[PDB]
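Repro case for the chain-ordering regression, as requested:
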Amino acid sequence: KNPKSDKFKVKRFHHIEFWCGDATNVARRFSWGLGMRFSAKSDLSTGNMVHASYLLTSGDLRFLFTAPYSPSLSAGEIKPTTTASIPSFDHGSCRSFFSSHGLGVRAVAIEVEDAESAFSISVANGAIPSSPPIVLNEAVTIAEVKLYGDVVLRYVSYKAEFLPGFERVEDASSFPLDYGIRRLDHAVGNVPELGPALTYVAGFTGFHQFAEESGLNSAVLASNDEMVLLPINEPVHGTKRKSQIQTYLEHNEGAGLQHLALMSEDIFRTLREMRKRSSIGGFDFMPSPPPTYYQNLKKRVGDVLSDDQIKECEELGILVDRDDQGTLLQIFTKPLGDRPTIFIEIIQRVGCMMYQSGGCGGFGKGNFSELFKSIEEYEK
Amino acid sequence: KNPKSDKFKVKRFHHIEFWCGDATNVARRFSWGLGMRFSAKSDLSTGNMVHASYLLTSGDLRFLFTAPYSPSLSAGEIKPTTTASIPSFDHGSCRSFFSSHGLGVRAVAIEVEDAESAFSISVANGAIPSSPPIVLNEAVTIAEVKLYGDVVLRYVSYKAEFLPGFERVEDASSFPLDYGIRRLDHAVGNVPELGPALTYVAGFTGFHQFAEESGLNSAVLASNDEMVLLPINEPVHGTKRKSQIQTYLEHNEGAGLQHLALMSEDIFRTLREMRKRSSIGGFDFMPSPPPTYYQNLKKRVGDVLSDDQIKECEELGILVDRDDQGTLLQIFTKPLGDRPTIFIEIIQRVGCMMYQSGGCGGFGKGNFSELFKSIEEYEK
Ligand SMILES: Cc1ccccc1-n1c(=O)c2c(C)c(C(=O)C3=C(O)CCCC3=O)ccc2n(C)c1=O
Ligand SMILES: Cc1ccccc1-n1c(=O)c2c(C)c(C(=O)C3=C(O)CCCC3=O)ccc2n(C)c1=O
Ligand SMILES: [Co+2]
Ligand SMILES: [Co+2]
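-- result from build under test --
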């Protein structure tokens, strides 16, 4: 049941912004490890004296990496005269964010029909304002409200090329890397208390709950067409293994974004390419499930995937789950930085043709059961 | 003339430590871009609740990347009970360093016969203490004194494997990258005033001055065998082009380390490998000199390098200079991070066989003249 209760017109995920200490090194690492191209920049060479911002793209996926310069470079500026291309940026907010949480997502950005209206309606419906609507070059409007912890939901709307004040990146500097990633599928928050978090976000967006010893309880909020998907987790305390949600909250100094799920047009090629690079600058993946997991794959998805497709899942450590309408292939990286906090999920969805409907196959909750069973069946 | 005035026994460069916001991402980028292997770690998985530290090695070159965790993880600790493997580390010093300078070198470390004595003698001779000698596992002694800005000179001495509390890195995580870099040749500071800087460092080390519109004046301090080489630059104001030393000081918020020079056993292979990776996560190089520069190469080094060796220099953008005892091949990267501050030099030295004596060929000062001449000769 989807009651289509969005309080403003939402289109799709637009971009994810990381706040960094050094945007250059994080962006180069991510570009190589994920196969994303350098597509736009805003930094000293473009006249921005406040922050360095580099955009990576793969298909529709946009990763933005931002870090502050010395405040002394812009000490004479005021907000009306700023050279920052992202006017919501603030030196002390960024340094405090990074000192508090380490490397992580500052903004989850979605494209809307009118960022000014989305903001007003959101705050009218309980959203805590973060940065008021600002019009850039009479061309783009951006506004921000608090989502959870120090993560903001950022509204972007266009009259009719990333943001004003960004330049396209030199063809020589932009190597056309591509491992198959095409768009952001969902973005997941960890909070101490799921209930108040759900009530707050659903309160100001109008997003509806999406049809659903693991360490957590979770729920998923969705836009009208269910293309914007925002799960939220809370810990479940006092168990055999310690809750990874609780571990996150401790090392992140509170609530924040837990994982980004990136849809691939070919998860087997994406994982082959990422795994080749794991030990030469890229990303590591979580430990592979036992062969018992893959022995049991035939009995549950043998109708969707061939024996060779299933054997390819075993080589790459891919996980498989399934809904009543579709099948999900997924895998998780190890944490992206120093702290055991944010990680990435690679996913591909099979089914729900109508175009493919959002959430087709779920989010892999059934893989908790199948992993536990397999990781006792393999013991013998 | 080398009066061998070292006030304690110095052996050679030991390691360079970068203070980072996220050690993981800087270290992975550097590993891929320079061809260095992951060799040791000290982090949560080794019991260190204070900082994450990752060591990269290539030959004798050791790059250490360190970033602080949340202070909350170690709030109950005191210095006697610390889990930090580098006891001179301090959360607030590290965050203040990085907020002030961005990514850069915190420590230039040299191996000495006794770090306790080196420290005492240094301070007895004017050095500003930074961290007193501390003995690790009755096996290694480390101490630190101020060098310039917020950069420290770190003394390390061993009784007879990087540091106690570091673990060797997993063979699966340690891919054997190698592009030919073998050791640190020199490490260069930028200061507002060269005179007082020279007097201060030479005062407490006993290092002697090494035989010597560019934007700078510079001088080089050397150990007894001249294997430890520490140039220092100051700006020269009011000129056609703005001093790059002055640009550094402005963007770095004061004095600090300007460049690290890494000796290659085969600079042509090193530069081929680094240049292949420039646009896929590695390092960019400064713009290549004009063909006039390379046309003039025959008349000055045609006796050292063949026509093919000189043509290979032109393909790779290598610079060549020469002393009275040796020849220097060198090239400079673009800045390593967001700010136009620290960069890397790749070098190879030809001559001065005795083993090769330090500084063989100089530091490339003559390449200022030859670059200016070439960059007017090419105009026509
Ligand atoms: C628990 C755990 C510990 C150490 C490494 C990995 C895991 N771990 C996961 O983190 C995990 C996740 C994060 C999802 C997932 O993507 C997800 C949810 O957890 C809630 C619904 C929305 C959503 O997107 C699904 C299955 C998972 N499974 C099966 C698993 O084992
Ligand atoms: C000035 C400048 C501007 C934009 C990019 C590059 C340059 N630039 C240099 O930075 C440069 C350096 C840094 C050295 C060098 O390694 C060095 C010194 O400058 C002082 C003595 C000790 C030492 O090691 C030598 C030649 C150089 N040359 C020729 C050059 O053009
Ligand atoms: Co997920
Ligand atoms: Co040099």
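Ordering looks correct now. The two ends of chain B are 43 Å apart (CA to CA).
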